[PDB]
Symmetry: D2
Subunit: 526 residues, 4 copies
């Protein structure tokens, strides 16, 4: 490779990248989807949780997660081991990869991470796809929310009926309804958490689930009505986009590092789109000499509480593969001492954000870096709780980029200055009081340190936002307009939670995909 | 539903693919089946080849953890002393590879497998030494060096990958001086041979193409027309559950497609099981094929491991390369310097001391990626070197894996149960292994003083070098499952592959060896 | 009371304090022994390891140790929890007690600790009393070493014969002699480590040991030849000496805080002695406006390696051979046996290899009770042997403790702040120490594979063998605080005691040595 | 270490009932209400072990009460 072009170029094959490609190609455009990562499946950006084994052991998929997530700024500044042989060589403040000696740990965002793969995080994510609360979460310069959301949910294959038939789901909902005692807004009750996923129909494999990966989003535009691959879409793994080259607000081409074969590549296009997620997107701009005042400012995520509980005996008391007995792992004299149907769909509930409740509760079981259930414990016993609270978007919170240090892609090393705003503090605490009461209503806590109730360290949410936020005017408070287009540029657009300018509690991916579709229409129109 | 080829190979591990390579290349038609998914565009590509792993080695351990799955998890008596009594509890879960019949004290805790197109061969550290003529090989195999040669070609074995390592030199100097020509000069301190090769692609010379099963298959996957070769077919996500057989001729394989979820029957002239140490016997056990020796003579390597921080003296001695046309690859510019005084693209030290006279153990002085001894994310891993000694485990019938009749694993197949202990005889030598490993470490610096990097014996299983379960012999003695052509006693057309076949205690990394014996079996199949 | 006086006043009832009292009182002087700590036994400064239970469970006495040791500078400057409820209150850099926001952790001495008790550390210590190597460890301006050492050993009840009869002791010594292969100087062989202790004689209680506490040192002078208490000695627990008041090089009195009843006390004396150990001694001076240039400089200890091993099967095989009139003392009868094949009353292996030519480090192969490497409660500690090597730390002026003017410790005295790093010169030998320690361990078995028992260097302070802070010299020129009579430059009647006095890098357990130099100073005072 | 949690059994150090009291030599008690051992003239017990009744409070003061009681019983005769 060396020099090539398409109508449109999309940096990042995350969920959001693929959304653009889907919409754009489907409406007659030709695009190149670029990612710095490798493809980890026969087809690009397949969801890795779909594999048989993960259908059988959920908790194991956390190992794929840990393999996908890569810390962005690791403080190295003062590391000194008090008990190392003095004959041995040591040096503090390494700079290698995402090591950063200029990072103060105390203003850091420790679990600010990214994934570099064809699919981004969308090949490991837990697929939770809620909509923003009309009053508390949405902003109103976007006029056609429910249209975009609808179109996004179609692409993501959103569904609420996946865990509908859960026995544990019922048992819990009953106890929670009783706990709250009609004090929730009846418009936002305890209810089934909507997910980009769907129960399979393939014989007894209805016991299993097809989670949505970016693949699923691309699939309809990947081949023509001739089963030949579609020329209008091309996917380029292992291509680090380093620089956008631009003259007077028009972007000409992209400077890209092919990592195998290791060669420079120039990519010319009529339109450029960066969906490299919260931190890497601004990084690319910063490194392309494009620095609006608001870039990487108004850094925001969700403050989170988390905890796990063991189901009450009361609940257990109260509670697919008929043609394959061996799928229950017992025969003859051996029985399963756990009294919970092995193929009981996982409890997957949410309480929305609502009046008096600026936070988003999930009562479920999924796979994350933290609170992995032990190997030797039947994970039917446990339920995970994850509350997500409002983080106010403020300019004194930011990621910046060192001029003299570089990351693993050889691009300006990110440095965080972040603290949770004092205003959101009292609501965060309320979040906790809430999460606890709810947990203890459906059983006792899993008494491991790892499952204790607790606030996560900043970054843990993986719901970073505001870094390339939108506004109505080139106010200096925003990077993009409401068509997700960069102030002062003809043909450069961004995608991802980074665009969101408005504190919220909900899982932002679906939202982001909406705004992308919007930008995509704006691109189609002219 | 129902399909056939000349030959069927269960397991697309390195050994599976070796069979396919040789068999297809010599005109046979093959179906390669695996219970796992394919983790790359092409089947069984090595995942360490990705750019990022070339930049951060330590990180690849996370892929490893994602590949390895414990086989018998004792659940029998788990009780939490501090749990709300309102909350429900029951010990001895049976779900997946949980096993209430497993005594922890005779267990092999880190007996694990990988279920992927490629098996462990898409994560492994690619070390391909040969067995010591006298101490490790056995005599009933006549043509060792021919097979080994043919295997090394397929694996793309190379010794020149880390040859130009500056740390590699600095260490070798200190170690040569430590040992003081006590080592047999036929087996000196030397570059560890690896299924890998330095890239040639411009500045990407600074990076490495590790060998995956893919690399082995590549030549036979398309014809001399770049159209895909009909003589090979690859089936991910197909759990082979039962081999159906009469009076020693195997008719077909009963297989679970997991997507779409449907039963499949696979008919073939010849069947080969390369499902690795434990899953291979499992398949037989479940097919009513139980020679006396099945899953007996369970054996691995007892291991010592430890990590050290390089002496100041060594670091001083190294101040001198790659990526000259890309300054930003060193992560600094202008006033910022890298405070680590070790060339960032200095090839990793990758040395071995063979097994030799008076030394029944195999030393590696290197840096690679395993579940254990991962270097912290806040420490520049140029500071560290990993040590891994592998000792002889004597093959004994009182050590075994067996298979419960009333419990099943994650594939719904008989739950494995281990009864394993290191033989008393190998005890003296194991301890000598340690004394050796430490002295060597302390000669090239001090220990990394983390708990995780302390010098220590690994718990059984950690080696991932399990052997003897379906071992070979000269006769249907009751002491072996297969003959020297890796063919199962009492069967016309059933063969096994993998370290499980090895009947002879050793210290070295067995994969290359196993691939040899496969080629042998493959010739026996071609020439019969 | 408010004002009291005696001929002599001794600050600190540590081993060294008591040594002065012993010698001084015994030669007709009258003394007040003051300590900021409480008395933890009927009699002052009894060793707490003497209790029956500790005779039965050694491992458990580590809990007394942990209770005795108090860190001196705890860095607070930047403590931030990443995962605390934001509604909740936080503030970094607390100053309370021995919290110190001005302490850089990276130049700190983390396990610089003291004990505050009638007895100091001498009521928990492991009682090892070796002498310094003539050539490699002693200094020459002290003329009468062997006389002082002899007198000190008598007071401490030093003995080598306590673990003489150890079966494990033999089994090990055999393997080690074979390992070393007569490479050692024959003047300093593998041998029984000398200890301030002695086997009891009291019937079957000969199976047990009387470890030496400061008590044991004082005992002979505490009562007259009438069993009535000796007026010439008085002990004051719970009296924090805060300030020495002095005019033109003569010390007049000591300003002391009684903590119960809480009242100021002034203590007048002809002679003053500070044996408040390495850090608190200089602290008292610093706070008394006495600041020689060398004070708290030349801070020095031992760099240490440590590790534990489980005995080889070979060794255990080689042994299967007290309390004959008490079967139940073996914890079994009839059909129940002890599955551990190691005589329950086999004296503990207590060996050392001295410092010698080519070996500037002091090895102990033993089992004793420390903050670290405590053997788990579910493991029979007969299985294990502890290794502790002590290496030379060069005395350097760029290593020091200093004292903040605007922060105070738990006694309300200037907060100590450390600036300490192991000297580059001693680095190569430290590493040799390790190579040595390991080889030795692996010759007598395999490592106890717990994290806690892995072979390792201790963090600075762990030795508890701090030295050089108030070091001696020959003249007020080359920077020292005291002369060779342990007397402070430019003062008539002020003396110091303790390892702080030692000006000379060494590897051995310094307490016995310190007691020598004290006796010396004491004679100087008697003359 | 400071998370909310149930302690493992024993952690309370408030053990009771082992030598509990009753009204009669019922086989359900060791001591009588004067903390005296059934079938003995002159042997008494003291401590939370005497308490026969589930409770939540810190038992030491209680135990001291019952002791004073037993002590009076001893004085009185
Ligand atoms: C890890 C994770 C995330 C997650 C989740 C659970 C886990 C374990 N659960 C979620 C949930 O329940 N609901 C939800 O809404 N989100 C959840 N998430 C997060 C979700 O995965 C992210 O919100 C989403 O993946 C972000 O999508 P976006 O398209 O913004 O892209 P990305 O996947 O973060 O990464 C995009 C790609 O950009 C490529 N890249 C980056 N830098 C470059 C450069 N310089 N050049 C070229 N390509 C680049 C990356 O490789 C990545 O593929
Ligand atoms: C994990 C690992 C392994 C490793 C290593 C480092 C790590 C981190 N370093 C090595 C080294 O330096 N040198 C060496 O020689 N080996 C090293 N290894 C191990 C090496 O990868 C293995 O020894 C080798 O891969 C074994 O090859 P084999 O072909 O024997 O098979 P496998 O890779 O173990 O897995 C075989 C496949 O069989 C499939 N399978 C299993 N059961 C079934 C059933 N019932 N049905 C269908 N398919 C089945 C598995 O899915 C697997 O893919
Ligand atoms: C803790 C320990 C120490 C130890 C050891 C094992 C353990 C677990 N093993 C040793 C060994 O085997 N051999 C050896 O030579 N030393 C060993 N040690 C150390 C040894 O115990 C000490 O070096 C020795 O105790 C030093 O004695 P010194 O007389 O210098 O005094 P101290 O015991 O350290 O305590 C001094 C007293 O001073 C009082 N004090 C301090 N400041 C004041 C003020 N301002 N006012 C009044 N009193 C004060 C302290 O309370 C203490 O009592
Ligand atoms: Cl042979
Ligand atoms: Cl405990």
């Amino acid at each position: 490779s060396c020099k090539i072009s398409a109508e449109v170029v999309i940096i990042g094959s995350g969920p959001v990248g693929a959304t653009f490609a889907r919409h754009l190609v489907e409406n007659g455009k030709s695009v190149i989807l670029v990612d710095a990562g490798p493809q980890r499946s026969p087809q690009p950006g397949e969801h890795l949780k779909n594999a048989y084994l993960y259908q059988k052991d959920r908790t194991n998929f956390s190992q794929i997660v840990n393999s996908e997530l890569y810390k962005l700024s690791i403080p190295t500044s003062n590391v000194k081991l008090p008990n190392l042989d003095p004959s041995a060589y040591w040096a503090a403040g390494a700079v290698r990869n995402n090591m950063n000696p200029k990072q103060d740990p105390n203003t850091n965002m420790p679990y600010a991470q990214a994934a570099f793969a064809v699919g981004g995080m969308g090949i490991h994510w837990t697929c939770a796809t809620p909509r923003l609360h009309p009053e508390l979460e949405r902003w109103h310069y976007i006029t056609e929310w429910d249209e975009l959301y609808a179109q996004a949910e179609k692409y993501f294959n959103t569904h609420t009926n996946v865990f509908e038939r859960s026995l544990r789901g019922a048992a819990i909902k009953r106890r929670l309804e009783a706990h709250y005692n009609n004090q929730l807004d009846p418009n936002y009750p305890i209810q089934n958490l909507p997910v980009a996923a769907q129960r399979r129909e393939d014989g007894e494999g209805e016991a299993f689930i097809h989670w949505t990966g970016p693949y699923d989003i691309l699939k309809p535009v990947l081949t023509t009505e001739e089963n030949l691959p579609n020329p209008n879409i091309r996917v380029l793994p292992n291509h680090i986009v380093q620089k956008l080259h631009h003259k007077g607000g028009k972007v000409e081409y992209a400077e890209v590092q092919s990592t195998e074969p290791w060669e420079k590549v120039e990519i010319y296009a009529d339109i450029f789109i960066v969906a490299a997620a919260a931190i890497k997107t601004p990084q690319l701009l910063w490194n392309s000499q494009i620095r609006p005042k608001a870039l990487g400012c108004y850094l925001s995520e969700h403050i989170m509480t988390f905890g796990q509980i063991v189901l009450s005996k009361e609940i257990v008391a109260e509670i697919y593969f008929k043609e394959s007995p061996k799928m229950f792992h017992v025969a003859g004299n051996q029985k399963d001492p756990i009294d919970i149907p092995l193929y009981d769909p996982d409890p997957t509930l949410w309480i929305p954000v609502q009046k008096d409740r600026p936070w988003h509760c999930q009562i479920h079981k999924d796979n994350f870096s933290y609170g992995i259930v032990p190997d030797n414990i039947d994970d039917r016993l446990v339920v995970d709780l994850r509350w997500f609270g409002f983080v106010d978007q403020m300019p004194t919170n930011y990621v910046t980029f060192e001029e003299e240090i570089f990351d693993i892609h050889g691009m300006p090393q990110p440095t965080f200055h972040f603290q949770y705003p004092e205003q959101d503090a009292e609501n965060a605490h309320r979040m906790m009081q809430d999460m606890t009461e709810v947990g203890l209503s459906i059983g006792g806590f899993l008494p491991t340190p790892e499952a204790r109730p607790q606030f996560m360290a900043p970054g843990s949410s993986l719901h970073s936002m505001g870094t390339y936020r939108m506004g109505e005017s080139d106010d200096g408070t925003s990077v993009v307009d409401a068509h997700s287009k960069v102030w002062g540029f003809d043909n450069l657009y961004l995608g991802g939670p980074g665009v969101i300018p408005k504190p919220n509690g909900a899982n932002p991916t679906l939202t982001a995909a909406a705004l992308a579709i919007r930008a995509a229409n704006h691109i189609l129109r002219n």
